[PDB]
Protein backbone atom coordinates (compact mmCIF):
# COMPACT_ATOMS: atom_id res chain seq x y z
CA UNK A 1 0.00 0.00 0.00
CA UNK A 2 1.63 3.20 1.26
CA UNK A 3 5.15 1.78 1.08
CA UNK A 4 4.55 0.75 -2.53
CA UNK A 5 3.21 4.17 -3.46
CA UNK A 6 6.19 5.94 -1.84
CA UNK A 7 8.59 3.72 -3.76
CA UNK A 8 6.47 4.73 -6.74
CA UNK A 9 6.86 8.41 -5.91
CA UNK A 10 10.66 8.35 -5.87
CA UNK A 11 10.72 6.02 -8.83
CA UNK A 12 8.79 8.41 -11.07
CA UNK A 13 11.24 11.12 -10.21
CA UNK A 14 13.71 8.66 -11.72
CA UNK A 15 11.27 8.26 -14.61
CA UNK A 16 11.02 12.00 -15.17
CA UNK A 17 14.80 12.33 -15.28
CA UNK A 18 15.09 9.60 -17.89
CA UNK A 19 12.23 11.03 -19.95
CA UNK A 20 13.82 14.47 -19.88
CA UNK A 21 17.06 13.13 -21.33
CA UNK A 22 15.37 10.99 -23.98
Amino acid sequence: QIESTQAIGQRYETIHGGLDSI
Partner: nanobody, 98 residues
Framework: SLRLSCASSRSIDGINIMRWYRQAPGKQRGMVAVVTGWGSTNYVDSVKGRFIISRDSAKDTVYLQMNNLKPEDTAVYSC?????????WGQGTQVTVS
Protein backbone atom coordinates in the same frame (compact mmCIF):
# COMPACT_ATOMS: atom_id res chain seq x y z
CA SER B 1 40.41 19.39 12.08
CA LEU B 2 37.96 17.56 9.77
CA ARG B 3 34.16 17.56 9.82
CA LEU B 4 30.96 15.78 8.68
CA SER B 5 27.46 14.65 9.83
CA CYS B 6 23.73 14.36 8.93
CA ALA B 7 20.41 14.33 10.80
CA SER B 8 16.94 12.75 10.69
CA SER B 9 13.34 13.87 11.01
CA ARG B 10 10.49 11.53 11.83
CA SER B 11 9.66 8.86 14.42
CA ILE B 12 13.15 8.33 15.76
CA ASP B 13 14.33 4.94 17.07
CA GLY B 14 12.46 3.19 14.35
CA ILE B 15 16.14 3.08 13.56
CA ASN B 16 16.42 -0.13 11.66
CA ILE B 17 18.87 -0.02 8.77
CA MET B 18 19.68 3.68 8.68
CA ARG B 19 22.48 4.12 6.23
CA TRP B 20 24.64 6.71 4.55
CA TYR B 21 25.32 7.04 0.85
CA ARG B 22 27.82 8.95 -1.30
CA GLN B 23 28.08 9.81 -5.00
CA ALA B 24 31.16 11.12 -6.71
CA PRO B 25 29.72 13.20 -9.55
CA GLY B 26 29.11 11.37 -12.79
CA LYS B 27 29.14 7.99 -11.07
CA GLN B 28 26.52 5.59 -9.80
CA ARG B 29 25.10 5.71 -6.29
CA GLY B 30 26.99 4.31 -3.33
CA MET B 31 26.42 3.26 0.27
CA VAL B 32 29.16 4.08 2.77
CA ALA B 33 28.22 3.41 6.38
CA VAL B 34 25.39 1.48 8.00
CA VAL B 35 24.20 1.83 11.60
CA THR B 36 21.01 0.53 13.17
CA GLY B 37 19.23 0.79 16.50
CA TRP B 38 21.13 -2.11 18.01
CA GLY B 39 24.52 -0.45 18.13
CA SER B 40 25.62 -2.07 14.90
CA THR B 41 28.86 -0.82 13.38
CA ASN B 42 29.93 -1.63 9.84
CA TYR B 43 31.30 0.52 7.07
CA VAL B 44 32.41 0.55 3.45
CA ASP B 45 35.79 -0.92 2.55
CA SER B 46 37.18 2.61 2.27
CA VAL B 47 36.16 4.43 5.42
CA LYS B 48 37.51 2.21 8.16
CA GLY B 49 39.84 4.60 9.87
CA ARG B 50 38.47 7.34 7.67
CA PHE B 51 35.12 7.67 9.36
CA ILE B 52 32.77 6.84 12.23
CA ILE B 53 29.04 6.37 12.84
CA SER B 54 27.19 7.89 15.76
CA ARG B 55 23.57 7.73 16.86
CA ASP B 56 22.00 10.38 19.12
CA SER B 57 18.55 9.08 19.99
CA ALA B 58 17.71 12.37 21.69
CA LYS B 59 17.43 14.91 18.89
CA ASP B 60 16.24 12.51 16.19
CA THR B 61 19.59 12.22 14.51
CA VAL B 62 22.41 9.92 13.42
CA TYR B 63 25.99 11.10 13.18
CA LEU B 64 28.95 10.32 10.92
CA GLN B 65 32.15 12.24 11.52
CA MET B 66 34.90 12.35 8.91
CA ASN B 67 38.50 11.56 9.82
CA ASN B 68 41.79 11.31 7.91
CA LEU B 69 41.58 14.11 5.35
CA LYS B 70 41.89 13.02 1.76
CA PRO B 71 40.13 14.94 -1.00
CA GLU B 72 38.63 12.13 -3.08
CA ASP B 73 35.82 11.84 -0.53
CA THR B 74 34.46 14.95 -2.26
CA ALA B 75 31.05 13.97 -3.61
CA VAL B 76 27.29 14.45 -3.34
CA TYR B 77 25.92 12.66 -0.33
CA SER B 78 22.78 11.23 1.34
CA CYS B 79 21.81 9.72 4.69
CA UNK B 80 18.65 7.55 4.69
CA UNK B 81 16.88 4.79 6.61
CA UNK B 82 14.45 1.90 6.16
CA UNK B 83 10.91 1.69 7.55
CA UNK B 84 8.48 -1.00 6.40
CA UNK B 85 11.08 -1.48 3.68
CA UNK B 86 10.22 1.76 1.88
CA UNK B 87 12.83 3.44 -0.30
CA UNK B 88 13.88 6.54 1.62
CA TRP B 89 16.21 9.24 0.36
CA GLY B 90 17.41 12.78 0.90
CA GLN B 91 19.61 15.48 -0.64
CA GLY B 92 23.23 15.33 0.56
CA THR B 93 26.30 17.50 0.97
CA GLN B 94 29.83 17.92 -0.46
CA VAL B 95 33.46 17.44 0.65
CA THR B 96 36.75 19.13 -0.13
CA VAL B 97 40.53 19.36 -0.67
CA SER B 98 43.50 20.49 1.46
Amino acid sequence: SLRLSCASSRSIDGINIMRWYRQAPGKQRGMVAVVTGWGSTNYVDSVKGRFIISRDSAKDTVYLQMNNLKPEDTAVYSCNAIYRGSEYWGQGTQVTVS
